[PDB]
């Protein structure tokens, strides 16, 4: 039932879209172009800010390994969630990564819809979200796209993983 007429792929470019981002400096809007041209981009998506494989796992991991990731020739880390931006600042704050990495909100899923991760996680009351995913991204083109299959599982797409493809 989904739309999967497009299912971003290995090759492929990233569409252009914009992620509102609350930063210490304040509320800020990081468009596809500024994160990923010229770069070399470790892009993470999660189900939900605050659920518990996002927080107790997926993200302290990328957290715990962003030094040792930095240091293999990334430029930045961002990770991406269908949630608003205030709680998107919010667990930015409450996880500790609050500068370390980007908490980008694709609130409407504009960015998920448009490569065509959209995931329909209702019964656990998070509705419409992103699949956990993580991709390494090279001036805006896909090199490396570990899409998790259960979103309780966050191995394939965990920092760990990815350091490994470094």
């Given at each position: 039932?989904?739309?999967?007429?497009?299912?971003?792929?290995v090759?492929?470019?990233?569409?252009?879209?914009?992620?509102?981002?609350?930063?210490?400096?304040?509320?800020?809007?990081?468009?596809?172009?500024?994160?990923?041209?010229?770069?070399?981009?470790?892009?993470?998506?999660?189900?939900?800010?605050?659920?518990?494989?996002?927080?107790?796992?997926?993200?302290?991991?990328?957290?715990?390994?962003?030094?040792?990731?930095?240091?293999?020739?990334?430029?930045?880390?961002?990770?991406?969630?269908?949630?608003?931006?205030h709680?998107?600042?919010?667990?930015?704050?409450?996880?500790?990564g609050?500068?370390?990495?980007?908490?980008?909100?694709?609130?409407?899923?504009?960015?998920?819809?448009a490569?065509?991760m959209?995931?329909?996680?209702?019964?656990?009351?998070?509705?419409?979200?992103?699949?956990?995913?993580?991709?390494?991204?090279?001036?805006?083109?896909?090199?490396?796209?570990?899409?998790?299959?259960?979103?309780?599982?966050?191995?394939?797409?965990?920092?760990?993983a990815?350091?490994?493809?470094?």
């Open positions: 039932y989904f739309q999967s007429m497009m299912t971003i792929a090759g492929d470019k990233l569409p252009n879209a914009t992620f509102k981002e609350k930063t210490a400096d304040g509320p800020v809007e990081v468009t596809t172009e500024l994160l990923f041209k010229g770069k070399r981009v470790v892009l993470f998506a999660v189900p939900g800010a605050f659920t518990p494989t996002c927080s107790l796992n997926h993200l302290p991991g990328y957290l715990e390994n962003r030094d040792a990731i930095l240091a293999r020739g990334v430029d930045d880390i961002a990770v991406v969630a269908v949630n608003d931006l709680v998107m600042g919010a667990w930015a704050t409450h996880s500790g609050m500068g370390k990495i980007h908490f980008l909100s694709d609130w409407n899923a504009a960015f998920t819809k490569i065509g959209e995931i329909d996680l209702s019964a656990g009351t998070l509705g419409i979200r992103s699949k956990r995913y993580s991709m390494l991204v090279e001036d805006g083109v896909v090199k490396a796209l570990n899409i998790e299959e259960s979103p309780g599982q966050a191995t394939a797409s965990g920092a760990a990815m350091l490994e493809l470094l």
